Amino acid sequence: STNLKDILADLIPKEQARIKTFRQQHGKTVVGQITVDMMYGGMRGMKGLVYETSVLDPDEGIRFRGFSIPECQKLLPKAKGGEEPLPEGLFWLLVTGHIPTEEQVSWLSKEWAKRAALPSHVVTMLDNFPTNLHPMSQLSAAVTALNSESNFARAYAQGISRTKYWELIYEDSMDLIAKLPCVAAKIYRNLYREGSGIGAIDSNLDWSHNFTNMLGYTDHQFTELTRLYLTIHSDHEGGNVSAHTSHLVGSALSDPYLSFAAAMNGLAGPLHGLANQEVLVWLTQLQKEVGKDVSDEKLRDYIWNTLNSGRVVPGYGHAVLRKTDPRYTCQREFALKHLPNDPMFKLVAQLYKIVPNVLLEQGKAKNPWPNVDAHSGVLLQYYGMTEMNYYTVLFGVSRALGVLAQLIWSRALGFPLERPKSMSTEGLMKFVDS
Amino acid sequence: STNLKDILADLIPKEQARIKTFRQQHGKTVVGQITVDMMYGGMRGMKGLVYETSVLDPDEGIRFRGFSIPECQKLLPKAKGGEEPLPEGLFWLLVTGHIPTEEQVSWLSKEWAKRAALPSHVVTMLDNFPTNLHPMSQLSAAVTALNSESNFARAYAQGISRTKYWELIYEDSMDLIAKLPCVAAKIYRNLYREGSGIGAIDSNLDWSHNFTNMLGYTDHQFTELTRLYLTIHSDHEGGNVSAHTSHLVGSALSDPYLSFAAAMNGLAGPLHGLANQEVLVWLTQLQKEVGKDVSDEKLRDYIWNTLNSGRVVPGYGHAVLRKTDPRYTCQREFALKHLPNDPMFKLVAQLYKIVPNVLLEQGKAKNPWPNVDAHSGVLLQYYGMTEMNYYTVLFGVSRALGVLAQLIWSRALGFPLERPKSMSTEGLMKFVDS
Ligand SMILES: CC(C)(COP(=O)(O)OP(=O)(O)OC[C@H]1O[C@@H](n2cnc3c(N)ncnc32)[C@H](O)[C@@H]1OP(=O)(O)O)[C@@H](O)C(=O)NCCC(=O)NCCS
Ligand SMILES: O=C([O-])CC(=O)C(=O)O
């Protein structure tokens, strides 16, 4: 009823049988071609993997189990006295494919509060970490060290049946998610608050409220933003570096902790998790080379010169998207509500007007419209979250929801080891010549 | 001259041009189809990525830049009056494509000795890890925390040109390799030697010798085995999970510490680098019930029983290879030459003539021969390396050589972000209809 585990237990056999049938019939159906260019181009356009939780039509944006961001904003349960969707309900949707009732989201909130205790070696390790070790390295090192708690690793060693793998994965995942705000808040304070304590988990609050409590924020609006941020960053298909990494590491039957740890090292890379910071630093240098309240034409020039300099306009474009990312739109709406008269936000909203006009004239874009990262950093800066390095930790906490939801299903459906074939250049050349 | 960097700096242009020419010829040539089965089957049989350092012909075995294991054994520089090839020599071959001279291997030994100092924060972190935290997990956290030392991460933040990326990756990679044995040895000592110190690096010893010295071993043969072990586990194509993970994380421009750390989370998986242990356990379980001594049908029972029980003669087959891993043969030869009157080796050898009888007879199989992992554990055990949990750490240290050789080339060749396309079952079901 409210026990996610029994609900999942009921869904899984339906889904096994539905895939078994599908593979019997259409297993040998060709869905795409592989070229030389795709092999050297990082599997671009290559249909690589099955990923159930979410799907990104390049035209209309991410869909969580068929539901768009707007639909989730409406249907997903909210906090009492709040407007933004709770991450809890997102997670439930990703795991069950069903919109949760208020009671199930409350149940889940209690489960995650109850599983939030950190083992002392992990506390100790975060507290001894130096201030020059980046937040994302700290997050990953600590999640890896939490695998001491892994049910799944201990059970695998003792020869547990394949049919039961997903149960241990689920427990481990519920444990990880529950703990992530503690880990992340402990990093936040140790770096940016002279190592002050994270305080206590309130058993009756939602995941995002305990998190902001542990971060030291009391602004109700920052808690609403967090709930909106953690929902919308939760998943973005299987092919993004962090989801693919966790999928790949998961398939060797590495436990959730190690799987997720690997995903964060993926997310720590510039071309994945840093665009947020890359946009903010530019917006700051923009308002420091053109000044505030500038002119739409003065702006049009800055954009032109930037592209003539051969530099990118950060936050505009996507690997696969070809339109305004709904996660951008999502954030704009929240800005229009709670901080419409913010210098930086007006600038962002100004750049929405100009930037999609160039790039398409430049001819080089395909996607001239903005992505999520164009809009996230000014919301975070607005509420006093100014430490840019830390931003990707927030992304990572969010992305746990997506990839762990899917990891449960990957194990439920017995997905095997990911292991493609590679070729050398010299080997490719001989192969094409035959 | 003896500077690997300058040699590499002169190789790179030639290789870039050679790939440019190839893509300009065959960019759009089809080299494979993607089926629905492949997407469910973890990309099995799909030609996904380019990987230059090594190539696995499914018939003959692994080739490092063209050379087979026997060729490497005859050709590669060995240690003073030793018999086994130095890993240093292997790494030079993978980077350059060229068999190194004695002088080049001597220079490379020294470079790694000079780069071996651990930051204190890593030292502290390792000394504070508990004994219930797996050696592989310690290794992976330690490497991640080493990314505070990263040249490449710092340089990228400052806007360094693309054309220099490989140079910093080379610096980060040399330092990591240099430091790996220190980490690995500290883990060994903290778990299995009451936290006794690893001692000093010796500037006039090879990489493997400093490693055994730090492990606390003083057997000349053990050092020889290590040299051989670290050479032959070094690389095995790009499709394996540890190589592919590092390739994938690497493609976000995550530095080599993050990339390697994610690969260790991948290697830590039971379907990747835990076989070495399984064999030694299963062997002992055989040598208990059946006794040290065994007959042929004595196996037939165990095997058929186990194959009819759902288990499998451990490490007796691969997922792409379809023959007798030459790596085993390398070890068998070593034992016959050094540990012949050893009971467990005698048994492993006694199993090399019998097991082969079935497998094909079962029909439900592909490789009717052993792999690398069927034979490593007994050798290690012979020399007092009895801590099975640690065995994968030795694999980790080895595998650094392959994935980092490739990582330099990847950034040098300007390989882009790995971003394939995922589909839901729901989505795949619609796609086939049209
Ligand atoms: C997301 C991104 C990496 C996609 O790269 P991609 O799919 O390989 O690029 P495309 O297929 O659009 O390539 C077409 C051209 O448009 C360029 N382009 C894409 N977005 C651009 C932008 N905002 N400003 C300028 N040029 C841009 C590409 O660099 C490329 O230039 P080139 O062919 O002359 O070398 C790219 O749009 C980008 O760098 N965006 C800015 C950073 C960002 O917002 N990242 C976060 C999203 S993950
Ligand atoms: O989709 C991608 O490849 C990158 C990304 O924005 C994400 O993971 O959210």
Side-chain angles (χ1 to χ4, degrees), chain A residues 1-185 187-363 365 367-434, chain B residues 1-79 81-185 187-286 289-291 293-299 301-322 324-365 367-434:
Chain A
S1 174
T2 51
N3 201 316
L4 179 61
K5 204 184 191 183
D6 307 316
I7 297 160
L8 182 53
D10 292 350
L11 297 171
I12 288 162
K14 295 188 173 56
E15 211 51 57
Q16 290 163 341
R18 169 170 167 199
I19 290 164
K20 183 183 182 60
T21 291
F22 176 52
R23 294 176 71 185
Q24 280 175 342
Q25 282 176 228
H26 300 284
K28 307 186 185 181
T29 305
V30 174
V31 294
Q33 323 277 118
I34 302 155
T35 69
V36 164
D37 267 353
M38 297 180 187
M39 292 183 70
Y40 285 107
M43 307 185 190
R44 186 194 307 111
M46 150 181 319
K47 282 186 179 69
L49 61 168
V50 182
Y51 198 92
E52 302 291 7
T53 47
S54 68
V55 175
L56 176 70
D57 50 298
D59 55 323
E60 322 173 319
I62 189 64
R63 280 179 181 276
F64 307 123
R65 297 284 201 174
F67 297 91
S68 69
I69 296 279
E71 300 180 308
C72 289
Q73 279 181 291
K74 286 173 176 57
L75 296 166
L76 281 180
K78 302 166 167 61
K80 185 169 145 57
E83 306 184 79
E84 302 296 338
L86 296 182
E88 287 100 319
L90 182 282
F91 175 81
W92 190 282
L93 167 67
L94 292 181
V95 163
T96 66
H98 297 335
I99 296 287
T101 68
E102 301 269 2
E103 299 80 13
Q104 299 164 317
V105 164
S106 175
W107 174 85
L108 187 62
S109 298
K110 278 162 202 166
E111 280 296 296
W112 287 352
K114 290 167 172 190
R115 293 169 178 259
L118 288 193
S120 23
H121 77 272
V122 170
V123 175
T124 289
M125 157 184 165
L126 293 160
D127 289 1
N128 288 350
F129 274 159
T131 59
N132 68 319
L133 181 62
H134 186 286
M136 284 299 295
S137 321
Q138 294 197 21
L139 175 76
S140 175
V143 170
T144 294
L146 278 166
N147 110 305
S148 62
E149 310 307 284
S150 181
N151 305 122
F152 176 72
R154 279 197 285 279
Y156 186 86
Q158 290 197 306
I160 195 78
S161 166
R162 281 181 175 168
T163 57
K164 294 265 283 176
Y165 286 168
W166 72 262
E167 302 179 26
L168 284 323
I169 295 296
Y170 167 86
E171 297 298 339
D172 279 350
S173 293
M174 293 278 284
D175 285 348
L176 182 39
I177 290 163
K179 283 167 197 175
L180 272 168
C182 291
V183 170
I187 292 168
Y188 183 76
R189 300 190 83 112
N190 291 0
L191 283 173
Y192 310 112
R193 293 199 190 314
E194 289 193 299
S196 55
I198 66 178
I201 289 284
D202 177 341
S203 149
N204 287 289
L205 299 176
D206 65 284
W207 192 62
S208 298
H209 197 187
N210 284 302
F211 183 26
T212 50
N213 277 356
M214 288 186 297
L215 285 170
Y217 288 67
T218 50
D219 194 320
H220 174 81
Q221 278 306 301
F222 183 67
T223 303
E224 284 287 287
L225 176 64
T226 296
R227 290 169 179 130
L228 180 58
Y229 184 105
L230 291 184
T231 292
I232 66 170
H233 285 81
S234 66
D235 216 10
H236 213 246
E237 257 191 16
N240 74 70
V241 160
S242 56
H244 186 188
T245 293
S246 72
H247 187 81
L248 178 57
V249 166
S251 74
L253 294 185
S254 294
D255 62 64
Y257 292 97
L258 304 186
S259 300
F260 181 71
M264 293 299 100
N265 286 4
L267 192 70
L271 297 181
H272 193 13
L274 262 62
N276 176 343
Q277 298 86 307
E278 292 184 72
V279 178
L280 207 43
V281 175
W282 179 77
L283 301 162
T284 298
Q285 156 123 103
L286 168 56
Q287 246 165 197
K288 199 222 6 249
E289 280 166 341
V290 308
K292 237 165 42 151
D293 345 301
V294 77
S295 112
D296 293 294
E297 347 132 329
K298 280 163 92 204
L299 211 54
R300 174 143 1 118
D301 316 327
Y302 193 97
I303 321 300
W304 270 130
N305 290 57
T306 298
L307 311 167
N308 296 314
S309 324
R311 325 194 250 90
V312 79
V313 183
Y316 285 81
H318 205 86
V320 18
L321 269 171
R322 298 295 175 243
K323 196 185 287 169
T324 306
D325 174 18
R327 298 176 295 156
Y328 181 85
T329 311
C330 188
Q331 284 179 118
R332 169 181 172 67
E333 292 180 6
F334 183 95
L336 287 178
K337 280 172 208 167
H338 304 288
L339 55 133
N341 307 297
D342 179 62
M344 294 292 297
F345 169 50
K346 298 174 186 190
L347 183 53
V348 162
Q350 270 194 243
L351 286 162
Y352 188 29
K353 303 169 58 177
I354 319 307
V355 176
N357 116 262
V358 308
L359 313 174
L360 55 93
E361 286 179 56
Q362 189 177 199
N367 187 202
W369 305 97
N371 64 68
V372 51
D373 305 298
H375 213 321
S376 49
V378 304
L379 294 181
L380 292 164
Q381 188 181 47
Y382 175 85
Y383 289 98
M385 171 72 63
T386 60
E387 305 81 1
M388 284 180 212
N389 284 335
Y390 186 75
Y391 285 6
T392 306
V393 171
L394 290 171
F395 204 139
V397 170
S398 178
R399 181 57 50 94
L401 297 183
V403 301
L404 299 168
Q406 175 56 56
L407 186 70
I408 298 161
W409 276 99
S410 286
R411 297 288 82 64
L413 300 173
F415 288 3
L417 187 73
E418 186 165 308
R419 210 289 179 214
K421 186 63 186 186
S422 76
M423 301 291 279
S424 58
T425 297
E426 185 188 10
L428 250 195
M429 284 176 183
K430 286 212 300 284
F431 178 76
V432 304
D433 284 2
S434 67
Chain B
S1 165
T2 46
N3 204 312
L4 179 52
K5 197 166 182 170
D6 297 303
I7 287 168
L8 183 51
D10 287 38
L11 288 175
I12 279 158
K14 295 178 165 71
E15 198 59 35
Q16 285 170 337
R18 180 173 162 191
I19 282 168
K20 181 184 164 72
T21 286
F22 179 46
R23 295 177 63 193
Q24 283 175 341
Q25 277 180 219
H26 288 293
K28 301 179 168 209
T29 293
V30 181
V31 292
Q33 307 290 107
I34 300 165
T35 47
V36 167
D37 267 350
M38 287 171 185
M39 294 172 69
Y40 285 109
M43 302 176 187
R44 198 198 301 130
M46 177 181 305
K47 290 195 173 70
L49 63 158
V50 172
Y51 200 88
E52 301 286 358
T53 57
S54 60
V55 171
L56 174 62
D57 28 325
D59 46 311
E60 321 191 310
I62 195 59
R63 281 173 190 292
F64 307 130
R65 294 284 190 177
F67 299 81
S68 65
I69 306 291
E71 294 170 310
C72 278
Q73 283 176 301
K74 290 195 169 64
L75 291 170
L76 287 173
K78 300 160 182 67
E83 304 178 69
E84 297 299 343
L86 290 185
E88 292 90 320
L90 183 283
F91 177 76
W92 188 286
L93 166 61
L94 297 185
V95 165
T96 63
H98 286 318
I99 297 285
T101 63
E102 311 280 340
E103 290 76 357
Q104 288 170 339
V105 165
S106 180
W107 175 89
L108 185 46
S109 279
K110 288 168 192 170
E111 277 289 298
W112 290 350
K114 293 179 173 176
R115 290 171 179 255
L118 293 187
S120 55
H121 85 274
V122 171
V123 168
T124 286
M125 171 185 172
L126 285 171
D127 293 348
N128 291 307
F129 280 159
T131 66
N132 79 314
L133 181 65
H134 191 285
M136 276 307 299
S137 308
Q138 298 199 31
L139 173 61
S140 168
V143 171
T144 292
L146 276 170
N147 106 297
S148 66
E149 307 310 279
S150 172
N151 295 122
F152 175 82
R154 276 195 280 281
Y156 181 101
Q158 300 184 278
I160 192 82
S161 162
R162 291 177 147 192
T163 56
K164 301 262 285 176
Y165 284 177
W166 74 268
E167 291 181 1
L168 295 302
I169 295 293
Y170 168 86
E171 294 309 339
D172 283 358
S173 298
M174 294 283 286
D175 287 352
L176 173 57
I177 293 169
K179 289 166 195 184
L180 264 166
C182 301
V183 173
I187 288 155
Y188 193 73
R189 298 201 76 105
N190 290 357
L191 288 170
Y192 309 128
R193 300 192 175 298
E194 300 172 296
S196 49
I198 57 171
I201 299 289
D202 211 7
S203 174
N204 291 302
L205 293 180
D206 58 303
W207 191 62
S208 306
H209 198 171
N210 279 307
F211 188 24
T212 57
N213 281 0
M214 288 191 297
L215 283 168
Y217 291 73
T218 64
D219 172 354
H220 170 86
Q221 275 306 309
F222 182 53
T223 297
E224 282 289 284
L225 174 66
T226 303
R227 290 166 173 138
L228 179 62
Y229 178 109
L230 296 180
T231 284
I232 64 182
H233 287 86
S234 64
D235 205 40
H236 203 257
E237 264 213 15
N240 77 76
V241 162
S242 69
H244 181 191
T245 293
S246 82
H247 186 94
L248 170 61
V249 170
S251 78
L253 299 182
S254 302
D255 72 66
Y257 297 94
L258 301 181
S259 300
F260 181 75
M264 291 303 98
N265 285 359
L267 188 63
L271 296 189
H272 203 356
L274 259 55
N276 193 350
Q277 305 91 303
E278 262 105 74
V279 187
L280 203 57
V281 181
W282 237 72
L283 277 189
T284 312
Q285 125 148 203
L286 162 94
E289 41 190 345
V290 322
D293 191 275
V294 70
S295 106
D296 33 51
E297 53 93 3
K298 283 218 208 81
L299 280 336
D301 320 317
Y302 203 178
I303 313 302
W304 290 108
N305 291 346
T306 235
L307 306 167
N308 307 333
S309 302
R311 291 102 36 131
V312 42
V313 220
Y316 248 95
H318 196 45
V320 20
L321 216 244
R322 312 276 165 242
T324 339
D325 214 310
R327 294 181 271 170
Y328 180 104
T329 305
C330 233
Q331 315 206 67
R332 195 217 158 50
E333 287 164 333
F334 178 95
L336 291 158
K337 191 185 7 142
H338 306 289
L339 46 134
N341 318 334
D342 166 73
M344 272 285 246
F345 166 53
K346 281 149 138 311
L347 158 100
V348 164
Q350 208 164 355
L351 285 163
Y352 196 22
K353 6 203 258 74
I354 303 314
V355 180
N357 37 207
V358 295
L359 310 125
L360 42 117
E361 297 186 0
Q362 268 255 117
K364 20 194 161 351
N367 200 153
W369 306 102
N371 68 46
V372 58
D373 299 300
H375 202 333
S376 31
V378 290
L379 297 181
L380 296 166
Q381 172 165 102
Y382 180 71
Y383 286 104
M385 176 80 62
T386 57
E387 308 87 358
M388 288 164 205
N389 288 345
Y390 193 78
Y391 287 5
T392 302
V393 171
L394 291 172
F395 201 154
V397 174
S398 182
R399 184 53 53 100
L401 302 181
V403 301
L404 292 178
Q406 178 56 43
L407 182 66
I408 300 160
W409 276 104
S410 290
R411 301 288 80 63
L413 292 179
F415 292 178
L417 179 79
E418 178 161 316
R419 207 294 174 212
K421 179 65 181 183
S422 69
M423 301 289 284
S424 65
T425 288
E426 189 179 15
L428 257 185
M429 274 168 193
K430 282 214 300 294
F431 186 77
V432 296
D433 282 21
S434 54

